[PDB]
Amino acid sequence: MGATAVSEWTEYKTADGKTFYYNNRTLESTW
Amino acid sequence: MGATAVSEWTEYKTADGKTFYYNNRTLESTW
Amino acid sequence: MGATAVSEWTEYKTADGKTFYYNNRTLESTW
Amino acid sequence: MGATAVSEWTEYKTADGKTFYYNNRTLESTW
């Protein structure tokens, strides 16, 4: 069982946002 | 260390939304 | 050290509604 | 005991919209 970090630098600019964009964190410190 | 972390960095640019993006991070701390 | 580290350094600059990107990022440390 | 580290840099400017990029990469420290 360890320590856990998510840390995401997501600058996403669509000019016309008819967007298709899937984003998941699965992030476990072992419950 | 006994730890897990996710240092993703992304500058994304697109004009028109019809483009396809998918992201599935997973990180799991067990040492 | 002990367990598991990732990085990404992303510059995606495609204007046209068309690009296909799929990312699937996993960092194990397990029992 | 066991520890792994992955990295990349990703640089895509496509003129005429075209690119497919599936990018699935593990890392597998301990087991």
Q: Which residues of A touch B23 (CB under 8 A)?
A: 22-24
Sign of CA dihedral C30, B1, A27, D26: negative
Distance CA D6, CA C31 (A): 21
The 8-class DSSP code of residue C15 comes to -
Q: Tell me the nearest-neighbour CA distance from C21 into chain B, angstroms.
A: 5
Which residue in A2, A15, A18 is closest to C3 by CB distance? A2
Using the Cβ of D3 and the Cβ atoms of chain B, whether some distance falls under 8 Å is answered with yes
Provide the strand spans (E) within C1-31: 3-13, 20-28
Q: B21, C20 in Cβ contact below 8 A?
A: no
Q: B31, C2 in Cβ contact below 8 A?
A: yes
Q: In whole angstroms, how far apart are CA D6 and each of A7, B5, B22?
A: 16, 11, 19
Instruction: Count Cα neighbours of B10 within 13 Å in the Cβ-side half-sphere.
Output: 19
Q: D19, C16 in Cβ contact below 8 A?
A: no
- The token pair at B25 is 């991070």
Provide the strand spans (E) within D1-31: 3-12, 20-28
Using the Cβ of A18 and the Cβ atoms of chain B, whether some distance falls under 8 Å is answered with yes
- D-A interface (Cβ pairs under 8 Å ≥ 3): no
Q: C16, B17 in Cβ contact below 8 A?
A: no
Q: B8, A5 in Cβ contact below 8 A?
A: no
| Structure determined via | NMR
